[PDB]
Amino acid sequence: DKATIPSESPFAAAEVADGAIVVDIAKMKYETPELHVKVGDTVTWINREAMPHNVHFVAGVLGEAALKGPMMKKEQAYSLTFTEAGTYDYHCTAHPFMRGKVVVE
Numbered sequence: 826d827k828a829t830i831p832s833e834s835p836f837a838a839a840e841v842a843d844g845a846i847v848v849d850i851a852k853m854k855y856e857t858p859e860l861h862v863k864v865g866d867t868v869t870w871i872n873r874e875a876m877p878h879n880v881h882f883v884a885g886v887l888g889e890a891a892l893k894g895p896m897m898k899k900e901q902a903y904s905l906t907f908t909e910a911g912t913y914d915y916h917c918t919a920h921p922f923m924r925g926k927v928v929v930e
């Protein structure tokens with residue numbers, strides 16, 4: 826794949842790793858909608874709202890399969906470790922008007 830998943834389900838905001846690149850989800854938006862990282866970086870999304878949110882990459886973007894991330898409740902987090910350069914678009918499954926991208930370079 827182009828990313829590995831440290832944890833298939835969400836974990837507490839306080840448990841975010843040292844060195845992770847954090848994207849907040851607040852005000853019904855990915856607060857960094859275009860994030861630039863390097864190969865081997867871990868990106869961690871943190872849901873700051875009552876409404877659940879995820880990140881969803883369609884098939885062919887992070888790998889053969891779609892990556893439909895788990896729904897994060899308020900103050901939960903979810904990480905992806907990017908292992909290959911590219912441009913990776915995502916949305917929220919529940920709220921597809923929420924769009925973001927990670928650029929790995």
Ligand SMILES: [Cu+2]
Pocket residue numbers: 877878879917918919920923
């Ligand atoms: Cu959402």
